[PDB]
Design a protein around this nucleic acid. Structure first.
Lengths: 97, 68, 56, 130, 272, 87
RNA sequence: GUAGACUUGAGUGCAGGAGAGGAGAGUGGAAUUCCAUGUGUAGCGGUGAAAUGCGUAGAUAUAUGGAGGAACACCGGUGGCGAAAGCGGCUCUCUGGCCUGUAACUGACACUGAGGCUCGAAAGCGUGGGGAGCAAACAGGAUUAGAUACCCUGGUAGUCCACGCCGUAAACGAUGAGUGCUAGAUGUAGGGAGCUAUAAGUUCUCUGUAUCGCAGCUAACGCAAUAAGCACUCCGCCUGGG
């Protein structure tokens, strides 16, 4: 019932054709859980100019999805977030908690 | 000369992490936080900001370690 | 981030920049107090009336 | 706790007179109405009034002072503690302060005074002296 | 997972119990045919050739999927059975084609997980991906330097394995004890975990039940003859000061390592 | 320890008077609900002894509960033993 | 005691927030030490100084990447939470406990608390790991009459992780639990309400935790609204010293 938020980053040199897949298999994770939002706005670069985890600038990705209640579907994600090589950093928080 | 907590200035509640430096002038020049004494903060409302600054310091949107 | 350099600094001017600003760095108190390790009940002797003596 | 409003109340009177102030408080019973009744009749307070609709109605009572808010009541205490319902005889009910003190006892008739408790051969529970 | 026996009698004093407690019921499958074999250590030559040994049973072994070179199928686990042989347990599997394939079991699998590789699959427990597909810092086994050739290497009864890294042709992998080989990167691999863990601490009282285990007992070298052993026998249980005691064969044993650094190896190493 | 739908639902079924959200029967409802909806969390890792003390004060709230609904009231629980039927 | 009634105590409802509350599941950086490593020379160590020592097998130091454990400076505070013990990188999981309002509702369900039960510092003890830095044990060098000590060089147990136990700590504030009463100057939280309006900034209310001090108060010291003041119910201790 709650909007979540997931912020991951990918190295910038990849293409848009990579980016569509690399958001839509998280559409696949939210369609196997099913607890998906309207659309995870999962690309919003603000800007990077600092090395947390050894990159000065990649491509931000901000998911921010509604889902079901406090159940398996939320914490299901990160086990399938670690698997991608392209992740630099992800983040997962509720609306205000 | 008021300049306390910035809370009445960004009144209210937003965000407190999706700024870049609008909330994050709470930074020091050395990547750490402004003092709660020099800033002179309202304690748990400072906690209402800093409880997501500690995120937003080290969320790879901000240099958490710096000098000068 | 680090500019390391005051605006067209000289030798004694950068010396006063590092003395003044790097004295307000806090870069020395936690080190000299981190000469040795202490008991955590002594870490709240640190977190005691030294700071309350500073403010109040 | 709530289990002694009697000595809670008399102790509160010692707060009012020892703190030399106007009004003390008491929830609504009948027994406390007899307390301020009998002792007002013996000249120690100056009001008999309580909150008009409450089973915990605040019996707020102006006191009877000396000459400068001066005390009249000094050794105020409940005799029979809640751990001890004091059950004395009727025939040799003792004097208080060699006569200089009050006495109030729930006898078989009612809750009557010192010498009325003495020579009427009525006996009950000792409550309070001064 | 270890129960106890109640100390009723002597010999039954400690008797650290099993807690099998987990394994599917009984009766392993009959077309799991592997013929039984006891060399009893002794060889083609057949004098003894290999030390203290012997006394088990007709240990009817069975074909596990040593290689698992199969592909992207509903590879259904059905049962996890007891192994007489090896420390971890085991599991039945049917593919689409109706076969009776069969794998080493793990810690927390269950019937119907049907886990498989193409190497299509992701990192969940029971996939035979190669480390060219597997990412960094994972917990695998069944990696053998010959591709198309199953378990000879550190697919390990006991605990499973881990992987530090990889580069180019090979893979920077620990095994245990601070050891790293660098294995050919497109050789197969089974992400997961060993079947059993606590089967390192079971203490069992009877010498004869260790004969039911099947090793005839081991002599000390001490009271043995000068004919027998370099422990030169004589008066008493005398000490041995004879420069680092050793085998009844002819090499010192404590200390020295015997690497054979002149190998088909040693460019696949760690510091130790 | 439940949402408003099963909260007010269990008030709705297990209330013997409408709007009596402080009924002893609704004390049985929420409290005798989260005894077994407390056991899920003690079996969650078997470590949170503070929640075990929550079970202490809620077992004691059950103790005042049926110690009172047997204590002063008697027969509106004697007809209502089969709410859960302890002991 | 028996029957009876009401909420006006308690709790349960509906709204608020809050926190290092617990327990798991993970992630990030700085920093230490080490693997190679640029390329160069005796260095570094420590104090009042050095021997300790290491190091020319030429290195520290400086160039980088890797490895691993630990812990997470300003945040951090007479701050909060938790009965305390205690709890602070970050994110989730299910998780108590209050307070503000509220009579919506039970109609005294209250307070306790021997017994019994649970939790619980700090070490250590069991099994199995993990093994950076620190450091019992011990060694070497000063030290002096002497040094089994303070200093230095090290350096084992041990510190950390799952997994069981002791039940004893200045347990402290050497101040039991419940609730009632009340001069004020005073902190700070987070609500409730007003409040100050063309953005400002004030007043009341509750639990919090100080500091001074009315009364009261003690042998004095001091306590004093989170009473060492005035009451009552549950418990407990205490009888001159060894």
């Amino acid at each position: 019932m709650t909007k979540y938020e997931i912020l991951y980053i990918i190295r910038p040199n990849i293409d848009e054709e990579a980016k569509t897949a690399l958001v839509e298999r998280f559409d696949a994770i939210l369609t196997e859980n099913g607890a998906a939002n309207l659309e995870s706005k999962d690309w919003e670069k603000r800007k990077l100019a600092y090395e947390i985890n050894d990159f000065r600038e990649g491509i931000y990705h901000i998911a921010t999805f509604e889902a079901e209640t406090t159940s398996e579907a939320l914490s299901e994600f990160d086990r399938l977030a670690k698997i991608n090589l392209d992740i630099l950093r992800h983040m997962i928080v509720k609306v205000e908690a | 000369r008021k300049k306390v907590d910035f809370i009445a200035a960004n009144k209210i509640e937003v965000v407190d992490y999706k700024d870049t430096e609008l909330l994050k002038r709470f930074i020091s020049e050395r990547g750490k936080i402004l003092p709660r004494r020099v800033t002179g903060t309202s304690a748990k409302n400072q906690r209402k900001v800093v409880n997501a600054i500690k995120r937003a310091r080290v969320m790879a949107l901000l240099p958490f370690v710096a000098e000068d | 981030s680090k500019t390391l350099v005051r605006k067209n600094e000289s030798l004694d001017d950068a010396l006063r920049r590092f003395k003044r600003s790097v004295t307000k760095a806090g870069t020395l108190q936690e080190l000299r107090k981190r000469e040795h390790y202490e008991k955590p009940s002594v870490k709240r002797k640190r977190k005691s009336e030294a700071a309350r003596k500073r403010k109040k | 706790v709530m289990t002694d409003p009697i000595a809670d109340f008399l102790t509160r009177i010692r707060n009012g007179n020892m703190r030399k102030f106007d009004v003390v408080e008491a929830p609504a019973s009948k027994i406390k109405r007899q307390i301020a009744e009998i002792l007002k009749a013996e000249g120690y307070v100056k009001d008999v009034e309580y909150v008009e609709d409450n089973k915990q109605g605040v019996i707020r009572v102006f006191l009877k002072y000396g000459k400068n808010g001066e005390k009249v009541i000094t050794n105020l205490k409940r005799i029979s503690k809640p751990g001890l319902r004091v059950y004395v005889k009727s025939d040799d009910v003792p004097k208080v302060l060699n006569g200089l003190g009050t006495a109030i006892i729930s006898t078989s008739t009612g809750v009557v005074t010192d010498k009325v408790a003495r020579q009427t051969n009525v006996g009950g529970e000792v409550i309070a002296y001064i | 997972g270890i129960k106890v026996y109640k100390p009723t009698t002597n010999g039954r004093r400690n008797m650290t119990g099993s807690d099998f407690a987990e394994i599917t019921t009984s009766t392993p499958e009959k077309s799991l045919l592997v013929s039984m074999s006891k060399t009893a250590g002794r060889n083609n030559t057949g004098r003894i050739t290999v030390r203290h040994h012997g006394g088990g049973h007709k240990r009817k072994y069975r074909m596990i999927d040593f290689k698992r070179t199969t592909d992207n199928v509903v590879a259904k686990v059905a049962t996890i059975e007891y192994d007489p042989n090896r420390t971890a347990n085991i599991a039945l599997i049917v593919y689409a084609n109706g076969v009776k394939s069969y794998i080493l079991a793990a810690k927390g699998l269950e019937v119907g997980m049907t886990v498989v590789s193409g190497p299509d699959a992701d990192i969940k427990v029971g996939n035979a991906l190669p480390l060219a597909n597997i990412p960094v810092g994972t917990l695998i086994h069944n990696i053998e330097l010959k591709p198309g050739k199953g378990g000879q290497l550190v697919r390990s009864a006991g605990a499973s394995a881990q992987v530090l890294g990889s580069e180019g042709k090979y893979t920077l992998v620990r095994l245990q004890s601070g050891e790293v080989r660098m294995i050919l990167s497109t050789c197969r691999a089974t992400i997961g975990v060993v079947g059993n863990e606590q089967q390192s601490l079971i203490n069992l009282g009877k010498a004869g039940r260790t004969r039911h285990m099947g090793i005839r007992p081991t002599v000390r070298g001490s009271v043995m003859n000068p004919n027998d052993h370099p422990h030169g026998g004589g008066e008493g249980r005398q000490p041995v000061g004879r420069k680092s005691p050793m085998t009844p064969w002819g090499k010192p044993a404590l200390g020295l390592k015997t690497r054979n650094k002149k190998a088909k190896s040693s460019k696949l190493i760690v510091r130790r | 320890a439940i949402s408003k739908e099963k909260k007010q639902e269990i008030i709705a079924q297990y209330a013997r008077k409408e709007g009596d959200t402080g009924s002893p029967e609704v004390q049985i409802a929420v409290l005798t609900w989260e005894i077994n909806h407390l056991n899920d969390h003690i079996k969650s890792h078997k470590k949170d002894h503070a929640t075990q003390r929550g079970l202490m004060k809620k077992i004691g709230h059950r103790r005042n509960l049926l110690g009172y609904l047997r204590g002063k009231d008697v027969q509106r629980y004697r007809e209502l033993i089969a709410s859960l039927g302890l002991r």
